[PDB]
């Protein structure tokens, strides 16, 4: 399998006009980055519903992952699942992004665009899906293997999953946010991988990326302490090779410079009075 290149984009999929759009749809930038980090009880309830629906759309599009299938076909399946549930696909028209999820194969770190690219035997495919319903977002991603994936590349996926699940388990009120990046990068570095630095987790509520940043590497200077009612993502991109990367002419797709493969998982988390709740479950 060699250096991916861009296929061709289908036209914008339509969203029935009854489904409420986030404010940024069709605008160049989003109104976000200065929202409260602690959600009201009502916003948290509504986020369990966004969360379950984006977890539905991810499993559904993930079941279609197979040698043969286009990434456009995954986007179609994700788009249709969100729409049939009354959810707007958060990515659609978000800063001009063209599709309803991001599909990121192999040396694509993140933000790959659904197109006519055909998944081949041995590929790894990340599907990243966000839902917007009742005023709030649910955000979640997983890397799926397609056919006979190399051991090297299976170990990578399962170890990225494992990093994310370790990170999540250490989420509790009163503990420092920098504990997440420490657990992740220590797990990663244990097997010689390299955690991506420029791309982060985020606060999420009534907005997509609300200004709260969640580093996936070890950075103790961050003073932020986790509080009950905090809602944020853990979404680590773990690289087999060098951290260096490039961006396609489409201005979205991020690829590793050395073309070595990379994997990611993501969940949307609630900090509770004593623990953690994962909102992006079925």
103 lies in the binding site for K ion (CB under 5 A): no
Q: Are 59 and 77 in contact (CB under 8 A)?
A: no
Q: Which of 117, 262, 268, 280 binds K ion (CB under 5 A)?
A: 262
Q: Which of 90, 91, 102, 104 binds K ion (CB under 5 A)?
A: 104
- The interface with K ion within residues 127-166 (CB under 5 A) comprises none
Q: Which of 164, 194, 210, 233 binds Co ion (CB under 5 A)?
A: 233
262 lies in the binding site for Co ion (CB under 5 A): no
233 binds, among K ion, Co ion, none (CB under 5 to 8 A by kind): Co ion
Of 145 and 229, nearer to K ion (C-beta) is 145
Q: Provide, rounded to whole angstroms, the least separation between the CB of residue 152 and K ion.
A: 14
What is the spatial distance between Cα 141 and Cα 204, in angstroms, rounded to a whole number?
15
Contacts of 165 (CB under 8 A, 6+ apart): none
Q: Return the range that interacts with Co ion (CB under 5 A); candidates 93-101, 153-161, 227-235, 236-244.
A: 227-235
- Two structure tokens written together for 36: 């409260």
- Annotate 70-97 with DSSP letters as a single string: BHHHHHHHHHHHHHHTT-EETTTTGGG-
139 binds, among Co ion, K ion, none (CB under 5 to 8 A by kind): Co ion
Contacts of 9 (CB under 8 A, 6+ apart): 72, 98, 99, 113, 114, 115, 116
What is the spatial distance between Cα 243 and Cα 262, in angstroms, rounded to a whole number?
10
71 binds, among K ion, Co ion, none (CB under 5 to 8 A by kind): none
Contacts of 146 (CB under 8 A, 6+ apart): 65, 66, 67, 69, 119, 120, 121, 122, 123, 124, 125
Of 104 and 206, nearer to K ion (C-beta) is 104
- The interface with Co ion within residues 191-220 (CB under 5 A) comprises none
- Token look-up 């992006």 returns 280
What is the spatial distance between Cα 127 and Cα 71, in angstroms, rounded to a whole number?
9
Contacts of 140 (CB under 8 A, 6+ apart): 51, 54, 55, 58, 128, 129, 130, 266, 267, 268, 280
Q: Which of 90, 100, 141, 262 binds Co ion (CB under 5 A)?
A: 141
Is 209 annotated among the ligand-binding residues? yes
Site string for Co ion, 47-86 (x = CB under 5 A): ----------------------------------------
Is 128 annotated among the ligand-binding residues? yes
Query: Which residues are part of a known binding site for substrate?
Result: 111, 209
Query: Binding site for a divalent metal cation: residue ranges?
Result: 128, 139, 202, 235, 266
Which residues in this chain contact Co ion in the complex, by CB under 5 A? 128, 139, 141, 233, 235, 266
* Contact residues for K ion, defined by CB under 5 A: 104, 108, 126, 262
């Amino acid at each position: 399998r060699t250096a991916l290149s861009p296929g061709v984009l289908s036209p914008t999929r339509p969203v029935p006009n009854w489904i409420a759009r986030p404010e940024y749809v069709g605008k160049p930038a989003a109104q976000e980055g200065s929202e409260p980090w602690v959600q009201t009880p009502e916003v948290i309830e509504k986020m369990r519903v966004a969360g379950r629906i984006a977890a539905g759309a991810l499993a559904e599009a993930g079941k279609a992952v197979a040698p043969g299938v286009t990434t456009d076909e995954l986007d179609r399946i994700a788009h249709e699942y969100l729409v049939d549930n009354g959810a707007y696909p958060s990515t659609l028209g978000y800063k001009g992004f063209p599709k309803s999820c991001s599909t990121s194969l192999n040396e694509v770190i993140c933000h790959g665009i659904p197109d006519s690219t055909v998944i081949t035997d041995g590929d790894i495919v990340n599907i990243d899906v966000t839902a917007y319903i009742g005023g709030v977002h649910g955000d979640t991603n997983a890397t799926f293997p397609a056919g006979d994936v190399a051991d090297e590349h299976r170990l990578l996926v399962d170890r990225t999953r494992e990093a994310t699940m370790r990170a999540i388990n250490t989420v509790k009120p009163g503990r420092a946010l920098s504990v997440i990046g420490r657990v992740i990068e220590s797990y990663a570095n244990r097997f010689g991988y390299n955690v991506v630095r420029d791309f982060t987790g985020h606060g999420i509520g009534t907005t997509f990326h609300n200004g709260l940043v969640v580093l996936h590497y070890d950075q103790p200077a961050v003073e932020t302490i986790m509080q009950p009612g905090m809602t944020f993502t853990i979404e680590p991109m773990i690289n087999l090779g060098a951290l260096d990367y490039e961006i396609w002419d489409d201005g979205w797709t991020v690829v590793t410079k050395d073309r070595k493969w990379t994997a990611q998982f993501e969940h949307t988390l609630l900090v509770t009075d004593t623990g953690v709740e994962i909102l992006t479950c079925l």
